[PDB]
Design a protein around this ligand. Structure first.
Ligand SMILES: NC(=O)c1ccc[n+]([C@@H]2O[C@H](COP(=O)([O-])OP(=O)(O)OC[C@H]3O[C@@H](n4cnc5c(N)ncnc54)[C@H](O)[C@@H]3O)[C@@H](O)[C@H]2O)c1
Ligand SMILES: NC(=O)c1ccc[n+]([C@@H]2O[C@H](COP(=O)([O-])OP(=O)(O)OC[C@H]3O[C@@H](n4cnc5c(N)ncnc54)[C@H](O)[C@@H]3O)[C@@H](O)[C@H]2O)c1
Ligand SMILES: NC(=O)c1ccc[n+]([C@@H]2O[C@H](COP(=O)([O-])OP(=O)(O)OC[C@H]3O[C@@H](n4cnc5c(N)ncnc54)[C@H](O)[C@@H]3O)[C@@H](O)[C@H]2O)c1
Ligand SMILES: NC(=O)c1ccc[n+]([C@@H]2O[C@H](COP(=O)([O-])OP(=O)(O)OC[C@H]3O[C@@H](n4cnc5c(N)ncnc54)[C@H](O)[C@@H]3O)[C@@H](O)[C@H]2O)c1
Ligand SMILES: Oc1cc(Cl)ccc1Oc1ccc(Cl)cc1Cl
Ligand SMILES: Oc1cc(Cl)ccc1Oc1ccc(Cl)cc1Cl
Ligand SMILES: Oc1cc(Cl)ccc1Oc1ccc(Cl)cc1Cl
Ligand SMILES: Oc1cc(Cl)ccc1Oc1ccc(Cl)cc1Cl
Lengths: 257, 257, 257, 257
């Protein structure tokens, strides 16, 4: 495939519904050698199966909430992979209470901090921890959401976190560009996952989205997976600091009433 | 003036170079009744001085780094201003080490945290606290910067914080609109302030914008002042959750070579 | 008023519902000396009436569809206003057939042409003609619409014309800045004007924005009027080549469901 | 390849330097069946060789300046291809005089009209002429430039034309989406071509661009070709109405002084 000869790390695989699973399948199909990470123990088994299925025996625990965890993970990886070609950042979190009802009422200093820390800093934290291991032509990918561009009901603080994320890409793209490291982000529409079961009245969100979307259908972890694969391949050598919207063109329309 | 009868709380005045000083200046001119806060005891005296110059004697202290400091301040304000028409958020901060050299090499979890806390969270924090005190037709206003839109050397983390800031404006604007609260932001061009001091090659940064800026000059606190007075008046009763660029059209140009 | 001593040429007044009528209204209030043009003989009388109401007797004719009509008008203006401080461009047009149904099925080379000519080109056309007549500190201003930023049903071609318009503002702003000419645009929310009449389900379009708009109401010509007066005054001497959205923050929201 | 089983039309092949040549090579390599069009006779031979090299014997004359030419071209094509999967729009023109020196001075009603007609309308004109021939999952691609977003010296009117182009994509994406037709555009940085020899002081443009670009190098017709191939393949089924910047991240940086 067009990913043949690429060693890529994939974070965030929690279920077969995970956007990361979609990205992995695609990259694997496209010839990429993979590695996986799992947040905690309660996902060791699950992630270990997916990896096996994807022909990968590199599965490591790590928690972005802790530097050490990030440092240790890249420590083990360096044993099998002293040098790879980027990783996929499919990480984001926010205390439930924060994602329901009035934003001004919901938001808290703690919640605000946690959301930005995991959903944003986590990205540069990893890059920072593996800067010297990256090969020339390497690529970093991260997932975002329209919430970073507009005020969406209930998304609340995740919105600010995503806005911070998206700027991180521009700041990361500019800094590592000279070394030959591209940094981009995919803005995917709403998908069928576990975390969304987290956001309030998510399911109506979807329905509206698929009725009013140009392509008239919501995006799959497949649509997102392929764009991701391409974005991490040399095929996109010319693109960096970009946030391509993979939401079947939902954000560019208005009043499709 | 078109600000007559209005009661506005101004924050961020640290010196005569302060942007807020320019804002308070214009606002007072257009006839609004002002209130001033000051971060700490080191600043108290001077703010009290400017306060007097502007016919004000309401000079409360407030360190947005603390929720106790914010509640107590608004509790003190309610004593004389049981109700008021908004406030100008002119605060921003990040450890010095953060604004120098490689963004990825310079950034840290702690720095990222503080920048986002003092610079982004504080805005809503202040809103949350005074929500009930705001009259219909009230207007909140904060200051941002291009760093939010594009990767600017040395600006680093502050850029992410501003991105989060600007998202905040939109989320705040959408939540309080129905109650009659407008929220906007002014993305200002650089101005030699005490803060600018900490920023590397700022003096050089100012020089580049000047020659390449459409209006062939950098903006003044007077420029920002007049705009904030407008954005904070009933004259802009149709503008909300907007980020108006007051940088003499620097951002809309390219390769002015 | 903050417009005192200023001499502004206002175009586009067709009725009391006209946005320009709102602009002229506010401008006159803030004390600017006005000049009015009228497209044709069908309109002459009414414009002359409004002109009188606003202490003006300078009512020239101008059909931006012709370069001869533009030169002659400014030639007529120079008679009494050898020098002035800018003009408000409030013109837009496109064959009716263009604003109904499938954009691709509705569009035509001729329609595309006329929309772009009357709506986009005319702005610079008028600038080219009065360039030498503008005092330093002058300000040009045009009206645009969201259609420029996102595909809005039925708006069709006008959207492309507005996109070109907004680009014009930026290119015009960068070219005249050095001479001291500021150029900006107001992207206004819908308002029931004679023109709106031609637009399908506009009445329905207004209803959607109202309920989903942050400030829970659509803007008024008064709203636009106050903003244009500002953008056309020395108060905004730091804003150029900018497109300030005066739509009550409708555009910065999403799924207000 | 990932384009296997796709019939695609490629317009704008004038030289081996042409961006279109780059897109063709890539698509061919990726398994796509191709067709070519040439503006006039003076390019019949050249384009006929490239096509042969690319294993294509479908080469037709056509001129977007004329509907009939567009109608006739799709007439012949329909004989061999009664149904294909999109076409590549690599068309744009503007009278030289328009692309040099002061924009306000340079721009003319004629020049303005011609630029928009060929550089913008040409796109929907073709789509309009081949709507019924397109298969489900088809994709339309068009090339744009940062000039559509910022005021670049000398680009002048091409800027407005590109801005109109980019809106056309959103309006075209929204209208044909429901039929299963994606419409996107690639915003490529400056490249080594014939038309650029057209724009004034183009070569300094480049140099600045490659010195200040994150990836620290200008994009090739290869980088642009691959992104184009991907954009026209099912791999990007989730993306539409998008304008991905293929300029090595130049637009997202600032003051890389
Ligand atoms: N779900 C959607 O519709 C949608 C749309 C756009 C963007 N996104 C974004 O795409 C990414 C993927 O999310 P998803 O929808 O696949 O959800 P998911 O629950 O399947 O994946 C989220 C993952 O984050 C990981 N994670 C959370 N906190 C962590 C921490 N402290 N340390 C280490 N790992 C941690 C979890 O282990 C989990 O695998 C997120 O950034 C999400 O916001 C989702
Ligand atoms: N200076 C420029 O060129 C420029 C350009 C765009 C935006 N801005 C923004 O303008 C705003 C005002 O900054 P300035 O340039 O006037 O500098 P300044 O140094 O005059 O103002 C900074 C202020 O922040 C206050 N502050 C810091 N930490 C605080 C805390 N924890 N609690 C309470 N108050 C605290 C200080 O007391 C001080 O008054 C900032 O938000 C900055 O990002 C400045
Ligand atoms: N109405 C809205 O809700 C809304 C929202 C955003 C922007 N706008 C814009 O506001 C501007 C003013 O329109 P309006 O809503 O006030 O409608 P209107 O019908 O009151 O104004 C249109 C004007 O265009 C003038 N005009 C048309 N063709 C002309 C030509 N060839 N030469 C000279 N003058 C010509 C007419 O004489 C008329 O005064 C337009 O640019 C429109 O796109 C309107
Ligand atoms: N050259 C760059 O650096 C750059 C950067 C961004 C975008 N672009 C754009 O990419 C596209 C490709 O241009 P290029 O750089 O390959 O130049 P080019 O001269 O190689 O290609 C332009 C083509 O337009 C065709 N054309 C012009 N007028 C026509 C008409 N009336 N009818 C039919 N065909 C016509 C010509 O025949 C020619 O093949 C253009 O839209 C250009 O603006 C170029
Ligand atoms: O960002 C998302 C956007 C959408 Cl539409 C759906 C799911 C998303 O993902 C999350 C949402 C909230 C939290 Cl707390 C964590 C994650 Cl991963
Ligand atoms: O945001 C700014 C942008 C510019 Cl051009 C100049 C000064 C700015 O303001 C700051 C920069 C750094 C820190 Cl620590 C604090 C502040 Cl207030
Ligand atoms: O641009 C507009 C946007 C809106 Cl919401 C309402 C009216 C508008 O204005 C026009 C629409 C069509 C034509 Cl033919 C002429 C004009 Cl002035
Ligand atoms: O759009 C372009 C942008 C760049 Cl940087 C280089 C070349 C470009 O292409 C053109 C420029 C002017 C004309 Cl008249 C025609 C074309 Cl095809």
């Amino acid at each position: 495939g067009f990913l043949s000869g690429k060693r890529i790390l994939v974070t965030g695989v929690a279920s077969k519904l995970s956007i990361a699973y979609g990205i992995a399948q695609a990259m694997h199909r496209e010839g990429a050698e993979l590695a996986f990470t799992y947040q905690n123990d309660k996902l060791k088994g699950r992630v270990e199966e997916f990896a096996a299925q994807l022909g990968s025996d590199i599965v490591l625990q790590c928690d972005v909430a802790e530097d050490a965890s990030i440092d240790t993970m890249f420590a083990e990886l360096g044993k099998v992979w002293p040098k790879f070609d980027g990783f996929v950042h499919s990480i984001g979190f926010a205390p439930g209470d924060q994602l329901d009802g009035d934003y001004v009422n919901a938001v808290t200093r703690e919640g605000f901090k946690i959301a930005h820390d995991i959903s944003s800093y986590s990205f540069v934290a990893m890059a920072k921890a593996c800067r010297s291991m990256l090969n020339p032509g390497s690529a970093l990918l991260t997932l975002s959401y329209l919430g970073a561009e507009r005020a969406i009901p209930n998304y609340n603080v995740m919105g600010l976190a995503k806005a911070s994320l998206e700027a991180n890409v521009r700041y990361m793209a500019n800094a590592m560009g000279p070394e030959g490291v591209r940094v981009n982000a995919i803005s995917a529409g709403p998908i069928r996952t576990l975390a969304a079961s987290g956001i309030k009245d998510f399911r109506k969100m979807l329905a509206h989205c698929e009725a009013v979307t140009p392509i008239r259908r919501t995006v799959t972890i497949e649509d997102v997976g392929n764009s991701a694969a391409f974005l991490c391949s040399d095929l996109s050598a010319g693109i960096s600091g970009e946030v391509v919207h993979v939401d079947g063109g939902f954000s560019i329309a208005a009043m499709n009433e």
